[PDB]
Every structure is written in structure tokens, then in C-alpha cells.
Amino acid sequence: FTTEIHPSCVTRQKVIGAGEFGEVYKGMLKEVPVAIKTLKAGYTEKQRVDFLGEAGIMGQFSHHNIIRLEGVISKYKPMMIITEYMENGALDKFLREKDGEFSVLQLVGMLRGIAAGMKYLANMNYVHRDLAARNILVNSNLVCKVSDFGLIPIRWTAPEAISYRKFTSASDVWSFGIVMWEVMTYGERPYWELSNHEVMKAINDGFRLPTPMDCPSAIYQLMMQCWQQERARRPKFADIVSILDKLIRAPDSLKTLADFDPRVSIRLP
Numbered sequence: 062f063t064t065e066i067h068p069s070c071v072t073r074q075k076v077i078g079a080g081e082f083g084e085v086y087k088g089m090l091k092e093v094p095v096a097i098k099t100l101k102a103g104y105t106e107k108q109r110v111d112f113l114g115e116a117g118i119m120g121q122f123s124h125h126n127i128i129r130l131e132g133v134i135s136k137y138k139p140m141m142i143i144t145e146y147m148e149n150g151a152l153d154k155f156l157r158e159k160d161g162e163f164s165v166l167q168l169v170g171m172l173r174g175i176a177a178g179m180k181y182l183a184n185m186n187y188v189h190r191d192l193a194a195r196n197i198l199v200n201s202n203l204v205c206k207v208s209d210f211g212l213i214p215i216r217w218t219a220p221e222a223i224s225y226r227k228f229t230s231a232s233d234v235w236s237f238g239i240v241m242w243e244v245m246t247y248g249e250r251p252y253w254e255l256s257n258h259e260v261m262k263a264i265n266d267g268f269r270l271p272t273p274m275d276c277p278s279a280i281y282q283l284m285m286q287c288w289q290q291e292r293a294r295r296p297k298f299a300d301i302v303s304i305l306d307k308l309i310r311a312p313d314s315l316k317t318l319a320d321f322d323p324r325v326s327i328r329l330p
């Protein structure tokens with residue numbers, strides 16, 4: 062059902078991270094570069110179910126803005142999940158290393174792509190639960206692909222998911238709003254140094270993240286509506302994609318900027 066790759070076609074080269082019960086590698090597939098997640102000897106029944114379940118769901122997704130599965134090794138050990146390789150890595154680190162290097166139109170384009178991937182997931186009845194810039198990969202065309210590397214992300218999570226574990230595509234919309242703020246700030250840490258409890262207290266008291274610098278008014282308005290306490294009031298991903306698409310296609314719309322609240326005053330004559 063899911064494309065099975067023979068192990069002789071896979072060459073693991075470099076460790077790039079860790080999995081639930083295995084490592085993640087960069088490698089080559091027979092040669093196309095790939096990323097490879099392994100499940101190592103001793104894995105439990107639950108871990109096998111979760112691993113092959115992940116491969117199965119990934120193999121069903123076919124969208125420009127969702128990481129693409131090349132295939133799986135399930136008939137030999139170690140088992141492996143093999144995806145396309147994204148040369149620019151994770152979005153959060155990418156933007157922190159490229160501060161100021163992109164145009165507003167490029168940044169908004171990345172958000173449209175993320176939103177289109179999320180619309181697809183939500184429509185497929187897949188709730189992500191961990192949407193954050195650390196879980197988005199960037200290719201050499203600046204295309205953002207929603208992914209999930211595994212883990213608690215209080216600062217990205219909607220109030221109802223924190224409070225009573227209600228994870229839905231509307232809590233993913235909240236998280237998307239946070240991602241919008243991450244992108245427009247080049248990977249600033251949401252809420253800066255506030256502790257997790259201080260973040261939750263602030264949200265419940267009605268505070269929201271302030272405008273990024275150089276942020277189109279329309280983009281700030283959209284992120285703010287993703288952060289409505291009442292789940293039913295938030296936009297759906299279809300609404301988000303539509304808005305972002307219309308802003309990009311009429312790019313003068315992005316020239317009107319929201320006011321940035323200075324945290325520091327410098328007086329010169």
C-alpha cells in the first residue's frame with residue numbers, strides 16, 4: 062500500500078536528529094538526497110503501530126505544502142521512513158539565520174504555503190497538534206512543507222487544547238497565528254522570556270502578542286483573529302488561504318503597515 066524501498070537503495074550518511082526509538086539521518090536514495098527515520102531493534106508494539114501508522118498517513122498525503130514520503134522499509138530491520146530532503150532545514154532556524162534577508166512578499170508567500178498545507182490536512186481530517194515553525198521545512202524554492210518531528214509547546218497551543226485537551230483544526234488555526242508571528246519576526250520566541258504559566262495567564266487576561274516590526278496591517282489583523290478565545294470565532298483554514306492569496310495577488314495591499322509599539326525611546330535632535 063505504501064511504497065516499499067529495498068534497503069540496498071538507501072545509504073545513510075549523517076545523523077541529523079533523533080526519533081521516538083531510532084535516529085534521523087540524511088542520506089541518498091537510488092541518487093536523490095533523502096531524510097531517513099529509523100525504528101531500532103527493541104521497539105515496542107505501540108512504537109511499531111505509531112511508526113507504520115505515521116508512514117501510512119504520510120503516504121496518503123499528496124500536496125505541494127506537505128512533506129513528501131518517498132517510501133518505507135517495513136520488510137527488513139531497522140524499519141525506515143524516507144522523505145524528500147529539504148536543504149534549508151527547519152523554518153525557525155532558517156529565519157533566525159537569515160534575519161532581514163527577505164521581502165514582505167516572500168514572507169507572506171511562505172505563510173500562504175503553510176496555510177494551504179494546513180487546509181489540506183484539516184480537510185483530510187488530520188489534526189496536527191504541534192504546528193510551529195520548528196515543524197516546517199524549507200526547500201531551495203522557498204516552499205514551506207508542513208512536517209512533524211515529534212516533541213510541551215504551551216506557547217503555540219490554543220487555550221482549549223491546553224485546558225481540556227481539545228485538539229482540532231481550530232486549535233491548529235491558533236497555532237498558525239503563532240507561526241505567522243514567527244515568520245514576520247524572523248523566528249523570535251513567542252512571548253519572549255515569559256514562563257509557560259505567565260503566557261497562559263496573559264492569554265486568559267486578554268493580552269495578545271504585539272505587532273512585529275514591518276508587518277502589513279492585514280497580516281496582523283489575520284493573526285489576531287486566529288487568537289480568538291472562542292474557538293468558533295476563528296477563521297477556518299479555507300478563509301486564511303483565501304485572504305493570503307488575495308493579498309499576494311494584489312501586493313500593494315501589503316504596503317499598509319500596522320503600527321509598531323516601540324519598547325525603547327531614543328531621542329535625538
Ligand SMILES: Cc1cn(-c2cc(NC(=O)c3ccc(C)c(Nc4nc(-c5cccnc5)nc5c4cnn5C)c3)cc(C(F)(F)F)c2)cn1
Nearest residue numbers: 077078085096097098115144145146147150207208209210
Ligand atoms: C499518525 C501521524 C502522522 N504524523 C505525521 C508525521 C510526519 N512526519 C514527518 O514530517 C517526517 C518523518 C520522517 C522524516 C524522515 C521526515 N523528514 C525530515 N525530517 C527531518 C528531521 C530532523 C530532525 C529530527 N527529526 C526529523 N529533517 C529533514 C527531513 C527532510 N529534510 N530534513 C532536513 C519527516 C508528518 C506529518 C504531517 F505531514 F502531517 F505534518 C504527520 C504523526 N503521527
